């Protein structure tokens, strides 16, 4: 994930909805566990501490992610993925002949 | 006293029906812009005549390949095998089979197999289509789609299987409705109609599609498959003759319930009576979603992959196809990112 | 930075000790708005109803946890992401999300709290006063206050049919002087009642409800207090009445029964008799405002009253119009009343409140921004009155903080406006000839 970054609106929403203050923890099978047993499993090695917790939920359907920018050769700004998005029109499509087909109104 | 109907199924999207088995990456070869699935017995028989049986056995035994010894093409390249006549079959490369490069990273490690018979020919079982028809009929009948369909006398809610009476009763007339509806399976179709789609999930909160490591063997869009449905009573005859206009009512409720929360270009259009068949179409296509709302999400509230709100939309990737109809040229999907609503199909039912 | 980031409601108490709710709106830059909802009514044919729990174990069925949950779990998901300055878009979005004309699903209290909080957060983000944000740059008129001073009717055990009596200090040069005059008359009346042996404790508005002999005795004591404070009745301070004749109107006989409150010795008056009674009261005393002189359904009576007295006295429809755009339009068409009482929680949103005020203004009517019985420390109705240049406010008596808060907000608005601030007084009664 390099073309996009975390949006500032979502970061502000998460910050002052305090969703990181209400984390949920999981064991290696992805089942909700109390923070005490999560700590005990992480210390024992039975849980990977990295991918085993969630930052609650942010409400309001905000865009989580915004395009990231970089510097072109002349010092102008540009979106990272705008210019290397595509080069060929992928050929396609295929026009299948299906004149014998009863459509439904 | 028997009524026979013919149900013609036209897939509008990839359709996968599994058997519980999965191809591993040590079982297929990605080359010449195709996925070749050889027969393991024929491969092993040709590999014992080349004095590489022990090498192949060590290749297959190894439980922890690092990154590249997990692919069969690595074995075929290191040991200098040029023959490719091992039986089996092939699937034409689409391009939209994995979001990464299939020959570079781990990529397609496992492929969910399509259901096949003893001859290795894929077909659609009659039990699968019967389950889809039963979901359509149960969701559009108000005497079955009510709160009495939930068995609350237990630790957690479940379905009331006795809501539609089935089985024999002591001293009572036989009252099995769905024994009268008899859905036969299909004549097997060819492996030329199979593709290698991948699971993408579209979230209404994230507003983007996220790919997942779940690759399936699916029927290509615009495949014609015929079923015969037999009815032995009168009520079931009315039900099956009303399979369309009940599929339309079910799809109208499904669109007003779930599909209206997603962009219109991600939702496909119907040529005939809609239906959702096989894996990947979602939970609401397989439940009485009016009564399963709330219960289904709370079943996953304590899992890491939590079901949020009404869930995500399942959108596989498959090549864009135009069709020629009386109205002109019809695009199967309205988007240019090549996103098919996974599991969608259309049907027409006649009274042969 | 103006994107609404968080909407959160919590349950608080209003001035009567009953529950209500309060909404906080945070935007991305950190702009904060807080809207608190006055306690209205949960019943009404064509009035925005508010959501109450009905749990008799908690607060006697007057809890607001349901409306709080509606804001936190329904409205918040729909409003977060909006621009905080999109007040009309947010309000229309909430109205569509509710989908009921009387706003019974989400609750009018919830929607009003969100609307006020959004407007306050938008004013905070633009770093402008709330009246400047709500009414634009041409906000200068300080409303003429109708200070409730003595209440009878259903709020007293005295033999008085009329619900409220008010003093209108329309002769003051500034709003500060008008407030001073009202406070001094309030204290002079308190002294007069203390030397008369009548009870001094205030009601739910801050006004007194003593055991007067009748309506005439109450009005005579009002003028006595005005003169004791040192002001000329009919030139500096006028008298207003809130009859609310809907409470003692008997619909079966189509008559106004004064026996309900004034005892069996009272006079039972028909529509014409009620007109004549109101006219002789206006002739005897310096009465400038009569509110709810007839029943809410007596349209022919209301029309006859408007022909009889609408040229010299202000006739305000409180329950006659119920802050309804359709009812106000009907009243304008039928030439019934010449003023409307605007209660913000009676309609549900600030956009509809404004729309009703402008519809009344365009017809020559006067919009009077009004309090509720259960108020709060929120004083947005003062900013509404200044923002619309309404020129009148009915924000209660001079005693309790649920009234003094709005009076202090108007003092702050006048101080902020400075030399541009205008107090028109009698000129605020533009619905009256000359």
Curated annotation (Swiss-Prot), chain B:
Superkingdom: Bacteria
GO molecular function: RNA binding
Keywords: Antiviral defense, RNA-binding
GO biological process, any: defense response to virus
A Pfam entry, by short name: RAMPs
Disulfide bonds: none
Function statement: CRISPR (clustered regularly interspaced short palindromic repeat) is an adaptive immune system that provides protection against mobile genetic elements (viruses, transposable elements and conjugative plasmids). CRISPR clusters contain spacers, sequences complementary to antecedent mobile elements, and target invading nucleic acids. CRISPR clusters are transcribed and processed into CRISPR RNA (crRNA). Csm functions as a non-specific ssDNase. Base-pairing between crRNA and target RNA to form a ternary Csm complex activates a ssDNase activity; target RNA cleavage suppresses the ssDNase, a temporal control that prevents uncontrolled DNA degradation. Viral RNA transcripts probably tether the Csm complex to the viral genome, recruiting Cas10 ssDNA activity which is able to degrade DNA in the transcription bubble, spatially controlling the DNase activity.
Binding partners and assembly: Part of the Csm effector complex that includes at least Cas10(1), Csm2(3), Csm3(5), Csm4(1), Csm5(1) and mature crRNA. The Csm complex is elongated and slightly twisted with a maximal length of 215 Angstroms and a diameter of 75-80 Angstroms. It has been modeled to have a central protein filamant of Csm3 subunits along which the dsRNA helix of paired crRNA and target RNA binds. The filament is capped at one end by Cas10 and Csm4 and at the other end by Csm5; ssDNA is thought to bind to the N-terminal HD domain of Cas10.
More about this protein: Encoded in a type III-A CRISPR locus.
Assigned protein family: Belongs to the CRISPR-associated Csm5 family.
Name this polypeptide is given: CRISPR system Cms protein Csm5
Organism: Streptococcus thermophilus
UniProtKB/Swiss-Prot annotation, chain C:
GO MF assignments: magnesium ion binding; phosphopyruvate hydratase activity
Record EC number: 4.2.1.11
Subcellular location, record wording: Cytoplasm; Secreted; Cell surface
Class in the EC hierarchy, top level: lyase
Residue sites binding (2R)-2-phosphoglycerate per the record: 163, 343, 372-373, 394
Binding-site residues for Mg(2+), renumbered to this chain: 242, 291, 318
Superkingdom in the source lineage: Bacteria
PROSITE patterns associated with the record: ENOLASE (PS00164)
Pathway: Carbohydrate degradation; glycolysis; pyruvate from D-glyceraldehyde 3-phosphate: step 4/5
UniProt record, GO biological process: glycolytic process
Active site location: 205, 343
Keywords, comma-separated and alphabetical: Cytoplasm, Glycolysis, Lyase, Magnesium, Metal-binding, Secreted
Cofactor binding description: Binds a second Mg(2+) ion via substrate during catalysis.
Predominant location category: cytoplasm
GO cellular component terms, semicolon-separated: cell surface; extracellular region; peptidoglycan-based cell wall; phosphopyruvate hydratase complex
Catalytic activity annotation: (2R)-2-phosphoglycerate = phosphoenolpyruvate + H2O
Named cofactor requirement(s): Mg(2+)
Entry similarity comment: Belongs to the enolase family.
Function: Catalyzes the reversible conversion of 2-phosphoglycerate (2-PG) into phosphoenolpyruvate (PEP). It is essential for the degradation of carbohydrates via glycolysis.
The name this protein goes by in its record: Enolase
Taxonomic lineage from the root: Bacteria, Bacillati, Bacillota, Bacilli, Lactobacillales
